[PDB]
Amino acid sequence: KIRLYQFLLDLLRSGDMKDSIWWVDKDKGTFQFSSKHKEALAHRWGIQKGNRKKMTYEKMARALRNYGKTGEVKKVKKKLTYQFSGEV
DNA sequence: AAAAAGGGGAAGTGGG
DNA sequence: TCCCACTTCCCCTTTT
């Protein structure tokens, strides 16, 4: 099944959900979530995953924080902004 | 102050 | 069975 980081990257590079997420610094791989619209993106993640419960941004960031352990995505010190590793 | 964002141990779930 | 990649819970610390 698809990985969360790909889900997010595929969205950035396609362009749907520009109300929910966008590139802060594309070349560098920095992307940011919208405060008011992040939930709609998080819910789509769950619908797609086929989770039995409803996906929230809180639970999605919980998973996101795990990539900081393996390096795929890291949190940047700006509100709702993360950064993909040399893979973006 | 108050609310949003950030955090993380640990048990639980689904697919392979 | 076990492993992985989250997912759910629940509650606490920091930034805005």
UniProtKB/Swiss-Prot annotation:
Its main location: nucleus. Disruption phenotype: Knockout embryos die at a late gestational stage, with no viable embryo after day 18 of gestation. Mutant embryos produce normal numbers of megakaryocytes and erythroid progenitors, but some show an impairment of erythroblast maturation. They exhibit a multilineage defect in the generation of progenitors for B and T lymphocytes, monocytes and granulocytes. The keyword Cell inner membrane does not apply. Disulfide bonds: none annotated. Residues 2-85 bind DNA. Expressed in spleen, thymus and bone-marrow macrophages. GO terms for biological process: anatomical structure regression; apoptotic process involved in blood vessel morphogenesis; cellular response to ethanol; defense response to tumor cell; endothelial to hematopoietic transition; erythrocyte differentiation; follicular B cell differentiation; germinal center B cell differentiation. GO terms for molecular function: chromatin binding; cis-regulatory region sequence-specific DNA binding; DNA binding; DNA-binding transcription activator activity, RNA polymerase II-specific; DNA-binding transcription factor activity; DNA-binding transcription factor activity, RNA polymerase II-specific; DNA-binding transcription factor binding; DNA-binding transcription repressor activity, RNA polymerase II-specific. It is found in: Nucleus. Belongs to the ETS family. This is Transcription factor PU.1. The lineage of its organism: Eukaryota, Metazoa, Chordata, Craniata, Vertebrata. The chain holds residues 171 to 258 of 272 of the full protein.
